[PDB]
Amino acid sequence: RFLKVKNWETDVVLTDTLHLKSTLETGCTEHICMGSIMLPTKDQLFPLAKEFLDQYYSSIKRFGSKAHMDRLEEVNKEIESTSTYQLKDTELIYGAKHAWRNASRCVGRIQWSKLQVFDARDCTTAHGMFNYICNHVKYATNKGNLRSAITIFPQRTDGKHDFRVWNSQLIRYAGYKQPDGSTLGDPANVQFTEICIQQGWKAPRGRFDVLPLLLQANGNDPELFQIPPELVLEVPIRHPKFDWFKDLGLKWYGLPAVSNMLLEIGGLEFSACPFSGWYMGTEIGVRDYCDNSRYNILEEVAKKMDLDMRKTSSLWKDQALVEINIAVLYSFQSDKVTIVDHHSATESFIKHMENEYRCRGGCPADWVWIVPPMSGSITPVFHQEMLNYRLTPSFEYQPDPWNTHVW
Amino acid sequence: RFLKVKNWETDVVLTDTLHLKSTLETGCTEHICMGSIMLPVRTKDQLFPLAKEFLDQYYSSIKRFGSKAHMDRLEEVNKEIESTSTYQLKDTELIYGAKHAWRNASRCVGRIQWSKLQVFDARDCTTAHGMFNYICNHVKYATNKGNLRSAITIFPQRTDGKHDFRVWNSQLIRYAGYKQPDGSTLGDPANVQFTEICIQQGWKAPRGRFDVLPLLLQANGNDPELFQIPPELVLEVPIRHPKFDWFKDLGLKWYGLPAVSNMLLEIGGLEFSACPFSGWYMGTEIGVRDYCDNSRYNILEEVAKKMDLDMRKTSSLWKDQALVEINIAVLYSFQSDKVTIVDHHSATESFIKHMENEYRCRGGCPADWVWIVPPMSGSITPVFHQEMLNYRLTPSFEYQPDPWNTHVWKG
Numbered sequence A: 001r002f003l004k005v006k007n008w009e010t011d012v013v014l015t016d017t018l019h020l021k022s023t024l025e026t027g028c029t030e031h032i033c034m035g036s037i038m039l040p041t042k043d044q045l046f047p048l049a050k051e052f053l054d055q056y057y058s059s060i061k062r063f064g065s066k067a068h069m070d071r072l073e074e075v076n077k078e079i080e081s082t083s084t085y086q087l088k089d090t091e092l093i094y095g096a097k098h099a100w101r102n103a104s105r106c107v108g109r110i111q112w113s114k115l116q117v118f119d120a121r122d123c124t125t126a127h128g129m130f131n132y133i134c135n136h137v138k139y140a141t142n143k144g145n146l147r148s149a150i151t152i153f154p155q156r157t158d159g160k161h162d163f164r165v166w167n168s169q170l171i172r173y174a175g176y177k178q179p180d181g182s183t184l185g186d187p188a189n190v191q192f193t194e195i196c197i198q199q200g201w202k203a204p205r206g207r208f209d210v211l212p213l214l215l216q217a218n219g220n221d222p223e224l225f226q227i228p229p230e231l232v233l234e235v236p237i238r239h240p241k242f243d244w245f246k247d248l249g250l251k252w253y254g255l256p257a258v259s260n261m262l263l264e265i266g267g268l269e270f271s272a273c274p275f276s277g278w279y280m281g282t283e284i285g286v287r288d289y290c291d292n293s294r295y296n297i298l299e300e301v302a303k304k305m306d307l308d309m310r311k312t313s314s315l316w317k318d319q320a321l322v323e324i325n326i327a328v329l330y331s332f333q334s335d336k337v338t339i340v341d342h343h344s345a346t347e348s349f350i351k352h353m354e355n356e357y358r359c360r361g362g363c364p365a366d367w368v369w370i371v372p373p374m375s376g377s378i379t380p381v382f383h384q385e386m387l388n389y390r391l392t393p394s395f396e397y398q399p400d401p402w403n404t405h406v407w
Numbered sequence B: 001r002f003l004k005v006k007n008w009e010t011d012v013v014l015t016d017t018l019h020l021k022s023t024l025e026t027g028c029t030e031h032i033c034m035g036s037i038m039l040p041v042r043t044k045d046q047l048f049p050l051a052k053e054f055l056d057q058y059y060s061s062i063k064r065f066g067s068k069a070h071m072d073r074l075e076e077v078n079k080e081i082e083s084t085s086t087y088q089l090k091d092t093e094l095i096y097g098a099k100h101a102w103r104n105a106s107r108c109v110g111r112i113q114w115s116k117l118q119v120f121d122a123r124d125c126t127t128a129h130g131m132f133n134y135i136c137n138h139v140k141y142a143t144n145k146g147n148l149r150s151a152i153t154i155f156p157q158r159t160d161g162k163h164d165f166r167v168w169n170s171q172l173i174r175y176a177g178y179k180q181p182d183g184s185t186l187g188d189p190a191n192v193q194f195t196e197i198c199i200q201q202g203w204k205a206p207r208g209r210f211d212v213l214p215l216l217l218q219a220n221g222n223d224p225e226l227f228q229i230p231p232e233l234v235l236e237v238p239i240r241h242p243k244f245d246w247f248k249d250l251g252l253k254w255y256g257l258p259a260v261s262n263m264l265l266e267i268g269g270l271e272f273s274a275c276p277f278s279g280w281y282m283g284t285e286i287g288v289r290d291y292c293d294n295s296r297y298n299i300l301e302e303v304a305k306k307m308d309l310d311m312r313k314t315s316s317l318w319k320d321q322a323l324v325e326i327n328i329a330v331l332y333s334f335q336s337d338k339v340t341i342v343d344h345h346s347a348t349e350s351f352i353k354h355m356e357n358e359y360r361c362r363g364g365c366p367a368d369w370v371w372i373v374p375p376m377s378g379s380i381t382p383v384f385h386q387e388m389l390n391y392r393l394t395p396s397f398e399y400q401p402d403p404w405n406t407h408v409w410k411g
């Protein structure tokens, strides 16, 4: 019931008690581990509200105080009456910081307490959502010195009036199926690119077309908006040693901003909660650039390097991978856009886990996601045992809205 | 029930029913995943169901389920259990069991090979000198002058747990490790404790960087005894690089034959506590883990110094750069000397083909993603993108405590 995690590089053992507070289920049973699966009323809401307010009042050293008991009473009356309740600003901020803190797949959580929370609960239209979003993008981008931020749109009601950002990230590149049979641009976004086109976007049909926002307010039909080009910081990719690298024509955007997740706080559901931080270098150079189902540039790069591509055992893929990743980092650094390498981020996370074990009694962590997609065992996280479990407040996946929305 | 796994690179979806036959526990519950935890005297009444389940699996695999041979065998085992409290496997059933324990090993990327396993039956062994001779023969067979052949040697099973056969070595061939008074380590840091045991027992340590350890062999619950593997049987590969001519001067080498000797093999409820097994290396085992773990040979700094990379900031990726060169070196050296090795691209590609085959003929393939994904270049291997289901089937290889922690010394 009290659980130990061991670091096999350093022999440091930590004891986890925090898992006992865990509420949601994992996908696993005593018979089967699903650790590598990508995705496994009034009556319901009051318990969730109480659990939340209890931890909030605990966090501000006021557990069992007059004001604690009063608020529990207040929220209780409001659920009875209205079927829902509203969070105080302080609660909303706390809840959003804690959803990040609880994100077991997130290596960047040492930063969790510094999140800037933009309260957009007064938003009513898609044009309003667009304004809030542009403001978030400009604030977070900060001319290259990125700051973490979340923008929180109104909470779900009867669930026929959901706010949604149909985009998977605020800033992403279009993908277009070709006559040819190949894909132009990012193959991850073909379907959404098509949705934008059918809703009426005029696609320029290039390799790196920033997608328009498709914004849904109040369960209404979603609308298109272009993010002012001037607010989208992008980085041309060059290599500090290979002059030819630039001729690949590669670029990426500075601001990673997830917009398709659902934020749950005290039972309330925020279906539009775009959040942003900054990139770990491998996200772009290993996954975006080198996944076979993504930009898949490994072959072209290897060719420019004149490596022996005859045999897998020459490790030509591996050599090319390292160079691509060196270039991503050098390019961001040269243009002064915040980026972290996988060594520094994982070192940060081990230090963060130690803080959380010491200060909170644990840190839920998903090893499959935390270990970087290159050079795993040369980073400290590879050697660190992790316990994965689900705490609330939380960020959750939710169905893509086009499968759900009725026009 | 049916469970699906999806490959996120290919969209290939597979359906698992084999997990229904799983008996043993995982460590996980509905409230916690223990998937990255490294480690998450039997009665007659427990023994007969375990035997029956095993024998039913064996008779089904030879298409004789329910035959008179199957039924006579069950009754014969049942009678042996009630009167002697245990039972002996037939040679055929021992072969089937040892192969299946490999087939079932969820952390093994090399399982495409599982049905080609040379089984050496050492159940007539009685003494440590007996075990030495069996082990020498295994090494020489498996080594086969570089054309490595998978094999396992199976010593007598556990009886009362006071008469256990054990290889105290964690692998048959491994390098010594010496803690120096100044706190540095000479040789391999992973093997310090066991090296100290060997010295205590009388081994004369050459005290160098790659000294092959002596075997420490326990027969029949007796105190273990020391033996040196004939050097002429220990195939080694000097590590050089195809382009970097200074790489040889690092003084690196490694042995060709990886041979695990500290696991316990469970077949139909019976426990084989000494069951050394060998295959061949995937290159990353040596070039990533043995050479570059901070707690092992730890050569990254010295290699990157010699490549003259920028070592002032981790963001030059000097470690990742040095890591790749060392791994190229390991594979080049093994190939140049005609010693079997597999690269992590080949091995993971093979494993994915193995796993699809298994899903189709067997209804599943339990696999531990944390262990199957290689310790470098994870996502440019196909296994990174493959969902897997981890569950435990018997026959199985299981961990067991180090014998120096539990042995009752005779004197």
Ligand code: HEM
Residues within 6 Å of the ligand: A099, A100, A103, A105, A106, A107, A108, A109, A111, A115, A148, A149, A150, A275, A276, A277, A278, A279, A280, A283, A340, A345, A369, A395
């Ligand atoms: C400040 C810099 C940050 C870094 C460097 C970072 C790093 C990462 C990385 C590399 C991933 C894996 C993503 C992937 O492979 O696709 C991730 C996952 C995640 N992070 Fe962060 N993170 C940061 C900030 C944030 C913030 C501000 C939030 C929310 C407030 C957040 C919540 C998440 C969540 C929820 C996941 C898991 C997503 C999923 O399961 O699909 N992180 N983090």
Ligand code: HEM
Residues within 6 Å of the ligand: B098, B101, B102, B105, B107, B108, B109, B110, B111, B113, B117, B150, B151, B152, B277, B278, B279, B280, B281, B282, B285, B342, B347, B371, B397
């Ligand atoms: C034939 C070539 C083989 C290759 C390339 C291979 C590859 C591997 C590798 C790379 C690992 C992970 C090792 C580590 O990180 O420590 C492994 C684990 C394992 N393999 Fe193999 N394997 C082979 C044959 C065998 C054989 C013959 C057996 C037994 C009959 C075996 C049973 C295992 C087991 C039980 C593990 C898990 C060990 C643990 O949990 O500590 N494999 N395999």
Ligand SMILES: CCN(CCc1cccc(F)c1)Cc1cccc(NC(=N)c2cccs2)c1
Residues within 6 Å of the ligand: A038, A256, A257, A258, A275, A276, A277, A278, A279, A280, A283
């Ligand atoms: C590339 C896709 N990432 C999610 C992966 C995913 C999600 C749902 C379904 C999938 F198939 C795959 C998006 C993501 C999520 C969290 C963090 C990041 N990377 C970042 N550095 C940040 C984004 C926002 C704050 S930090 C990317």
Ligand SMILES: CCN(CCc1cccc(F)c1)Cc1cccc(NC(=N)c2cccs2)c1
Residues within 6 Å of the ligand: B038, B110, B258, B259, B260, B277, B278, B279, B280, B281, B282, B285
């Ligand atoms: C080096 C350590 N490996 C065990 C891992 C382990 C387990 C518990 C604690 C540890 F610190 C480390 C040994 C191992 C096991 C299985 C296979 C291999 N590698 C091989 N290629 C083979 C060995 C025998 C047949 S194939 C190595």
Ligand SMILES: C[C@H](O)[C@H](O)[C@H]1CNc2nc(N)[nH]c(=O)c2N1
Residues within 6 Å of the ligand: A035, A036, A037, A038, A368, A369, A370, B008, B384, B385, B386, B387, B388
């Ligand atoms: C099937 C497997 O779970 C899947 O490929 C995962 C593995 N680990 C990951 N880790 C991170 N950070 N991001 C991912 O998209 C994935 N993909």
Ligand SMILES: C[C@H](O)[C@H](O)[C@H]1CNc2nc(N)[nH]c(=O)c2N1
Residues within 6 Å of the ligand: A008, A382, A383, A384, A385, A386, B035, B036, B037, B038, B370, B371, B372
């Ligand atoms: C804590 C973590 O589970 C541990 O480092 C594991 C990770 N994956 C592994 N995978 C393999 N093949 N071998 C290992 O020793 C490990 N170590």
Ligand SMILES: [Br-]
Residues within 6 Å of the ligand: A107, A108, A109, A110, A111, A340, A344, A345, A348
């Ligand atoms: Br970070």
Ligand SMILES: [Br-]
Residues within 6 Å of the ligand: B109, B110, B111, B112, B113, B342, B347, B350
């Ligand atoms: Br193989």
Ligand SMILES: [Zn+2]
Residues within 6 Å of the ligand: A028, A032, A033, A034, A035, B028, B032, B033, B034, B035
């Ligand atoms: Zn699990």
